[PDB]
Design a binder for this molecule. Structure first.
Ligand SMILES: Cc1ncc(COP(=O)(O)O)c(CN[C@@H](CC(=O)O)C(=O)O)c1O
Ligand SMILES: Cc1ncc(COP(=O)(O)O)c(CN[C@@H](CC(=O)O)C(=O)O)c1O
Lengths: 401, 401
């Protein structure tokens, strides 16, 4: 008996673990449809054009590698707030916000949760949608808060249970915390309608709840970044001071570089200055200062007019491709002779499809076809190419037939 | 009264805050001797030659930016363990270790502390040397452990209080946790002698204490990396299963890229496999997966023979330069006419000098000469160039005169 004789074998991550299992298969037709990672039409990792050029400017410039302030690159930080808020926004304009570079979306989310654990004195409860991204639970749980839930998806109907959502939300206790996905809800791919959003705003406002927005997919819901930030902006303009986490992993394909941010909307710039100070104190003993490569690339794209415009064409091109794969999948299914209604596939937005396959079917897909996906029936359509869409549809059909 | 009306203005970081204050001064002769960051002889940020070439290979290769496993780049991870352990080591050879990429030294340290908080069932007390790096306190405190102390430095004598250290250590309760700096203790620049180390080993072994080693400066104590890893290796070969955190921020000048690692020495490779699994579960909800740029550069240097050999010449050159600045400082002091004994300056090793100036003198230095240093009298000699060593010595002299 040594120090760790009692430490048990823990299980593999429900999402991340999918790539580990995928890595090992020798089937040359294998497809990794687990994690949400964009693939180009050859079904290959895609580094955006603007990223490649950003990198080149960085090189050419022969920049140092000195430590960044605890809060991140100022240019990156100011530019992210602006991307979420919009440049004409009163909040942005008045400087009633504090944005801090974070370790991608996950990193930002945990900085937020930790912040909240420490300073949100009105409650310990965070309300998550049913269902929500698997990692939201443990993020809030490790930070020290309690998890609760509100109704959201209706599997019978493959859409939003708006009556249920509103019931639950109208009953959450005042001053509690509610988490909302800004756009391209994960994993359902179903977002509230503008009108629907207008109504949630009212109830949140009315019950005096802290709204925590998770904005991991800005530009993937419609293909337009301002349009994808609507609800978030609408909330702030209604007088709701939200907290928000942003990720650049998918919309800029910076996955492993880990670039993201966490923002707090405050009452004044003076308030923002004191929040900033406490966020630095929290981050110092966590990881000291954040990773520079992803933030330098992102800042350069966002702040360089030609790079930004190129970026936006690129985000549009990515979203479009996802659409075409959705379309073709459905068509292939009909073509294979599938009886089922696959309309939800083309109805859903974002990088995935919440298919509805049962765990026995998910299991067969992996073992007979070497198609890896999460156990809840979620598949990343973003990772399908023109060359294997046929393979996918045949498989889905066989296991469903 | 809004959400954060009660959040107070927190103070600036005792080290990191020095660079913020330094940034603002308009004095063209200002010197930032706060944080430990190497400067070349022109007093400029220095990106190693091998780093520059590593970067170039990476570019040329047109690598993707896909997410890395939760534990890091395998090549980086295997190579770090090896750099600390030595290639002939039984521990390394037998695979009785688990190494996980971490967010530099700070990141690794917190992963460790968090791990310990969760799995070290024999105690909540971490013993720190007096004095220790300021950030060790809050790292352990935020993770949820209790801090204790053992005697270490003797200001009267400007050296190690070995009798005191041993007294205190011989009385720490069995199965408690003790933190030791592998080499170039921060901030004293005084390390135990080999013989001294031999004696600490015995007492740690005897009281069955968990030894936690902080190895932030491998190659800066002597200019030789194997020699700097001696004590750490000696402990493991005596049968002590330590835990350790490594940083590549200074020895590879990867500061802002944040490359580091956390290792656990276990009884078997099977044990290592279960520890690994729990470390992944801890990291997933923290930052998901780590930053790739620093780890790719480091892996390439460590695993490419010519790059490694170049690296070692470079580490030696850096250490040598620090020595020459130490020498010249002392000489300048005599030359200026200083009565005091400045021998500790040349006696200390690593990037700093624990000068002994009082806070009123530190204050004057900043206001009259614009020389920034921490309030405990610690100065980074590593940041002195041939051109301002004279300025420094004159200043020190004026304020000491
Ligand atoms: C809703 C949501 N929020 C935050 C994140 C955080 O992303 P990063 O930390 O990588 O910036 C993701 C990524 N969800 C992906 C990836 C994953 O789980 O790692 C998914 O497969 O659902 C996400 O879907
Ligand atoms: C003893 C010690 N351990 C760990 C670290 C962690 O370094 P990174 O997180 O940057 O890898 C440092 C850096 N101490 C420096 C830098 C600092 O405080 O940020 C110092 O000025 O003491 C250190 O001195």
């Amino acid at each position: 008996s040594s120090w760790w004789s009692h430490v048990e074998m823990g299980p593999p991550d429900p999402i991340l673990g999918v790539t580990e299992a995928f890595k090992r298969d020798t089937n040359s037709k294998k497809m990794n449809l687990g994690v949400g990672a964009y693939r180009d039409d050859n079904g290959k990792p895609y580094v955006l054009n603007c990223v490649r050029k950003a990198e080149a400017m960085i090189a050419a410039k022969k920049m140092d590698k000195e430590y960044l302030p605890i809060a991140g690159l100022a240019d990156f930080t100011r530019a992210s707030a602006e991307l979420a808020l919009g440049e004409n926004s009163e909040a942005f304009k008045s400087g009633r916000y504090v944005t801090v570079q974070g370790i991608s979306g996950t990193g930002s989310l945990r900085v937020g949760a930790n912040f909240l654990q420490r300073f949100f004195k009105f409650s310990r409860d965070v309300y998550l949608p049913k269902p929500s991204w698997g990692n939201h639970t443990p993020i809030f749980r490790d930070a020290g808060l309690q998890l609760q839930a509100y109704r959201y998806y209706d599997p019978k109907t493959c859409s939003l249970d708006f009556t249920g959502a509103m019931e639950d939300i109208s009953k959450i206790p005042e001053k509690s915390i509610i988490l909302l996905h800004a756009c391209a809800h994960n994993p359902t791919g179903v977002d509230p309608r503008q009108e629907q959003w207008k109504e949630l705003a009212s109830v949140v406002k009315k019950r005096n709840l802290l709204a925590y927005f998770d904005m991991a997919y800005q530009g993937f819901a419609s293909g337009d970044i301002n349009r994808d930030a609507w609800a978030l902006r609408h909330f702030i303009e209604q007088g709701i001071d939200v907290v928000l986490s942003q990720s650049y992993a998918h919309n800029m394909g910076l996955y492993g570089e880990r670039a993201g941010a966490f923002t707090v909307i405050c009452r004044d710039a003076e308030e923002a200055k004191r929040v900033e100070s406490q966020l630095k104190i929290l981050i110092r003993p966590m990881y000291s200062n954040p990773p520079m490569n992803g933030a330098r690339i992102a800042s350069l794209i966002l702040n360089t007019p030609e790079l930004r415009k190129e970026w936006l064409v690129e985000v549009k091109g990515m979203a479009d491709r996802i659409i075409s794969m959705r379309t073709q999948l459905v068509s292939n299914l009909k073509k294979e002779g599938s009886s089922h209604n696959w309309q939800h596939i083309t109805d859903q937005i974002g990088m995935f499809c919440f298919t509805g396959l049962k765990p026995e079917q998910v299991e067969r897909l992996t073992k007979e076809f070497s198609i890896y996906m999460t156990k809840d029936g979620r598949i990343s359509v973003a990772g399908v190419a023109s060359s294997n869409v046929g393979y996918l549809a045949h498989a889905i059909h066989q296991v469903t037939k």
